[PDB]
Design a protein around this ligand. Structure first.
Ligand SMILES: Nc1ncnc2c1ncn2[C@@H]1O[C@H](COP(=O)(O)OP(=O)(O)O)[C@@H](O)[C@H]1O
Ligand SMILES: Nc1ncnc2c1ncn2[C@@H]1O[C@H](COP(=O)(O)OP(=O)(O)O)[C@@H](O)[C@H]1O
Ligand SMILES: O=C[C@@H](O)COP(=O)(O)O
Ligand SMILES: O=C[C@@H](O)COP(=O)(O)O
Ligand SMILES: [Mn+2]
Ligand SMILES: [Mn+2]
Lengths: 161, 489, 489, 161
């Protein structure tokens, strides 16, 4: 009743959708640090269901105690930050499940966290899940893709340097 | 040739020597005793301020190998609000100095309120009914000494502030003057009229005889024997000036004994509607400018409390270290209202309180919390500032003693979601006074001669933890609300 | 010939050896680790209780030079409420022990309340909806383990309490029994019917399969290999017994990890109307008697907190010394709700809080305050007791670890305005269990054989400071009210 | 306008009225520690005005910080306790003025504290001012006088041993 056990279809910097749904303008996020690109830059995603995964091969860095967000450095020298939803730290980690661990090397696609889209749907302040590159300056160019994305499949961003 | 500054702080008295290039040549610091006669009370020994200051001076001159011959002028900065009264003949206090923190004249304010001067007081002083300022302090003093008022009308009794007092002790009694910055702090002075308020002076039974002469924050007031004393300004305002506050919309935050956020309003005295005080600062040549101020009673002192009473640490410095050993306060909160809540709360009845403890909270959670209180409060004052002024800060310029704490700084940054800029020279408060003095002596001519010693040492940018900030603050808010109104009346 | 007692406390596990004369021959203490998985949570390692206990035993026998040959029986006392579950085959916990303090099953109670069992629960258990007792603990455990309930109906899963568990580990699995005292604490047992409540067992989805057999607090339950284990009682109740509680109207207060005030109600289960629990104790031969109990979560532990986390002191003992260096708390208050407020507040949301701080409060004010909290709370529970029972105490009999603190004791006395009597042997809790065992073995025959080892060591009488007591309490009351409801839901 | 400067008229254990007014039964005091003679025994006095004074030659012992009460040991080995009013510690020392000091040797009559009978009259919970012997056991007999008393003049109690 779950495909985890089965084989899946398998096909400059490309950041891969770490979770699924429709891409949204960072500027769209109802939080300034996001919208004014204080924490950095990138896109946001209105989620479809079940899980967040590594968007680059690399090593997981932080995993928030309430595990609704995590960080990770790419083997290519990029810091990404994924933050499920808005103010989600208040949920107090409910709706979340930590699959990975704070220091792992990961391939694109490995499960990082799992979650409950519907509790989060009615409990959370917002569901948008910004994905940002933190080391803004260390990067040359930042290209933002659109529409639908599929976890660990569609790319959300292309980046130079 | 160099200027000399005197910074007579709440915690300690200092002395700085700068060259024309504005270089910090030598410094002299000397802590002095805080005294607590009773609960919400704080006092200092007028003669000790005095003593500690004088000494600090010498010691510096001496340290650098400087002669009276080579010093262009003297700048003076002091702690605000804190009130003194002294016999004219003698040069002797008729009582210790009541401190700015000092909650004693609380009831009096309760009258003042009861009467209806709130509106008046705000409107002309730009201040707020609070034991924080000078009026009530003076009144309480005369009301508690037998031969007082009378002795004062006959004029045997001088009123003053650290500057007024620091000056007169150096100009052998010749000079009884305060500056504009200073005076606005007193509750007895009219900010529009730029003079003593009569209705105040009445209401509070104060006799003009004691009030000193009030003057520009730059002007040679007189000469002394280390010579001309050309500058005077309230510490907070001096720091404003030294950060090159000076232009509308410009703002700094100072982290010292307490915390003070000021924003220059040019020539417009903005009325606060969010618990901020409206007050006086300097314009680019020492001229009267207005400003919004947010005062927070306890910041660096909390640290001193962990340091000297609670004894958790050996140095304030060590707080960065322990605080870091923990990652989280573990749910603990520290409302440091050891002497009430100032801006924007203004509750002289709140008292300290620690919250949210459980069996496994330890020393380190507590220290960290104390540090964190500092950022919360700044944030509290900040928001008011923004509302009042309608302007949104993109960065926070800071200075002070605590600013050395990367932890605190950073944490400030995140909880704010704003860049924090840390100047290369922490001693900004002093610089102000110098500038204020050397300009006034042609030692500099122009502020622009100086747009360069304000090199920034470091920027603190929000980290991904900045995301939690609203969660963390809320608790803070919740804590605060429970520290309030402890003391009764 | 002698009896042996096992006192498995919250803080540590002990072992006592008494002769026929009831003389404390030798003791073995061994502290064990408290663990805090999260905020209001407390846990202990079942195997560590276990380990620490076993060991303590030996070590004693050994200490005195005693052989299995010479020991008449074995008495058992343990910490109440604290819940355990273990695989039958294995002899292995399926999770750490949830502690009596442990606030985790808070929500569950919130249901229970929401449903309307409050009335029911009170009425038959004599208890109150609180994460304090055993029910919810068990439920939470099964609800958090995959193969649980089911595994338990098939009956692979044992439920128990320190006694149930301490027993079965010694009778190699042969014996699965608890006593009456113990069981009443669980929330699953009916006090009138003297048996498992079904409606409870339902509501909370618990399967009888796990519940052990329930029995007199004196009876040989079985034999072991140091032999017959003849006594079992909840610690609090054992102390009651050892103080010779035993008769209607009789009461003690125990100052240990927490604080427990119990008063014997003979054969009448008095309904509390003041936040006290109605519960079971022993009658003079181990028979079911009823009682009123006031439970206070934190007392001696606060001291341990100043000791191990805050690190202000090196020994609990040192607290008398520092606390005395001060005369007054200087206005400070310490609500030690590190794990909620028990009687009579019962707020599993209150959390610790310190109040009324000012610049000059120091370490010593704080320690002293922590000590004082202990007396306040006792007072709180005391008053309820008096109301509920309609009887006024003229003296307070006490026992426990903290009772060594003349300061605390005296201070207790004044704040109470009652004599405080301090028994010559602090180890009363243990004695209970022995008595309970030797009586049950004809080791003694009669309690009267013993009306003499209860020699009083000291009386504490109210001092002239007793006059302030109402002033001091009021603040205390005021403090408390602000610690309440910190945590959210 | 005050006689402090002038000479006054001057006349087993006798405890002298330390303050003035009408003597009252300890049992009359609206506080149990008093009424049930827990702190000790003696009389109480409904006061007339202005001041409390030593009731025995001896040394002052305690002087409450809010100085509304004090203690004192007699040269004859008696501990007396004087407590102005009821719950007066709440007044927070308002209405009071400490004349003497915590360790003084005093003759009968010396001023110990001074006070404001009327503020205390409307501020205090009660005005009764128990006077008790604390070292109850160390004393043999306790005789209780009656009616009006005049400070540092009329005796309130006679005591054996
Ligand atoms: N690393 C640090 N962390 C926290 N506080 C610090 C640190 N170093 C020094 N201090 C604190 O900084 C303050 C000094 O502020 P400053 O601007 O000197 O004092 P003042 O109030 O006298 O003007 C003190 O309150 C001190 O306790
Ligand atoms: N002088 C003292 N003052 C205060 N607490 C004391 C003192 N001596 C020991 N303790 C405290 O007494 C308690 C011991 O109580 P006791 O009856 O042994 O412990 P338990 O909860 O394990 O049954 C501890 O909480 C300890 O921290
Ligand atoms: O409100 C008076 C302030 O100027 C306090 O200044 P300070 O921190 O330098 O002592
Ligand atoms: O409520 C359970 C009590 O029996 C705690 O007892 P204790 O202080 O001996 O650990
Ligand atoms: Mn300063
Ligand atoms: Mn015990």
């Amino acid at each position: 009743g779950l495909f985890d056990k089965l084989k899946s279809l398998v096909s400059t910097i490309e950041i891969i959708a770490p979770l699924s749904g429709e891409i949204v303008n960072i500027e769209d996020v109802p939080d300034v640090v996001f919208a004014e690109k204080i924490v950095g830059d990138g896109i946001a995603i209105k989620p479809t269901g079940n899980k967040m995964v590594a968007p680059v091969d690399g090593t997981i860095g932080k995993i928030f105690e309430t595990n609704h967000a995590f960080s990770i450095e790419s083997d290519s020298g990029v810091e990404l930050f994924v933050h499920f939803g808005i103010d989600t730290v208040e949920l107090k980690g409910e709706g979340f499940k930590r699959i990975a661990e704070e220091g792992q090397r990961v391939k694109v696609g490995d499960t990082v966290i799992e979650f409950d889209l519907p509790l989060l749907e009615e409990k959370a302040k917002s569901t948008l899940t910004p994905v940002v590159i933190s080391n803004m300056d260390e990067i040359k160019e930042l290209i933002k893709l659109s529409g639908s994305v599929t976890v660990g499949e569609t790319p959300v961003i292309r980046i130079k340097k | 040739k160099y200027i000399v500054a005197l910074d007579q702080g709440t915690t300690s008295s200092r002395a700085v020597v700068m060259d024309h290039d504005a270089n910090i040549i030598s410094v002299s610091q000397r802590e002095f005793e805080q005294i607590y006669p009773k609960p919400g009370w704080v006092e200092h020994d007028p003669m000790e301020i005095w003593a500690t200051q004088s000494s600090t001076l010498v010691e510096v001159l001496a340290k650098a190998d400087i002669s009276s011959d080579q010093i262009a002028a003297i700048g003076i900065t002091n702690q605000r609000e804190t009130t003194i009264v002294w016999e004219k003949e003698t040069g002797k206090p008729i009582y210790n100095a009541i401190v700015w923190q000092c909650r004693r004249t609380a009831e009096i304010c309760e009258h003042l309120k009861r009467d209806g001067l709130e509106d008046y007081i705000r409107s002309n002083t730009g201040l707020v009914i609070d034991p924080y300022f000078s009026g009530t302090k003076v009144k309480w003093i005369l009301d508690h000494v037998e031969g007082s008022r009378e002795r004062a009308r006959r004029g045997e009794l001088l009123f003053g502030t650290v500057d007024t007092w620091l000056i007169w002790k150096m100009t052998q009694g010749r000079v009884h003057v305060t500056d504009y910055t200073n005076a606005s702090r007193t509750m007895l002075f009219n900010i529009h009229t730029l003079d003593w308020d009569d209705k105040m002076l009445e209401v509070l039974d104060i006799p003009r005889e004691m009030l000193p002469e009030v003057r520009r924050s730059s002007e040679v007031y007189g000469q002394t024997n280390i010579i001309p004393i050309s500058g005077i300004a309230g510490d907070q305002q001096a720091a404003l000036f030294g950060q090159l506050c000076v232009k509308e919309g410009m703002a700094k935050n100072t982290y010292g004994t307490g915390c003070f956020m000021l924003m220059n309003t040019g020539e417009k005295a903005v009325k606060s509607e969010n618990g901020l005080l409206t007050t006086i600062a300097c314009g680019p040549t020492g001229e009267v400018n207005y400003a919004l101020e947010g005062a927070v009673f306890m910041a660096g002192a909390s640290i001193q409390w962990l340091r000297d009473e609670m004894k958790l640490i050996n140095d304030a410095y060590d707080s960065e270290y322990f605080a870091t050993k923990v990652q989280n306060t573990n749910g603990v909160y520290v409302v440091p209202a050891f002497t009430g809540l100032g801006a924007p709360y203004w509750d002289p009845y709140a008292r300290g309180a620690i919250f949210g403890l459980t069996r496994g909270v330890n020393a380190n959670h507590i220290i960290r919390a104390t540090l964190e209180s500092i950022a919360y409060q700044t944030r509290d004052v900040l928001e008011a500032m923004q509302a009042d002024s309608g302007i949104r800060l993109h960065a926070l310029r800071v200075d002070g003693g605590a600013v050395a704490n990367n932890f605190l700084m950073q944490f400030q940054s995140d909880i704010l979601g704003t860049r924090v800029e840390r100047p290369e020279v922490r001693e900004v408060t002093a610089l102000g006074a110098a500038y204020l003095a050397g300009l006034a002596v042609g030692f500099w001519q122009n502020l622009d001669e100086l747009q360069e010693k304000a090199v920034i040492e470091r920027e603190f940018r929000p980290g991904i933890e900045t995301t939690e900030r609203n969660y963390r603050y809320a608790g803070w808010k919740k804590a605060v609300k429970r520290a309030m109104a402890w003391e009764e009346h």
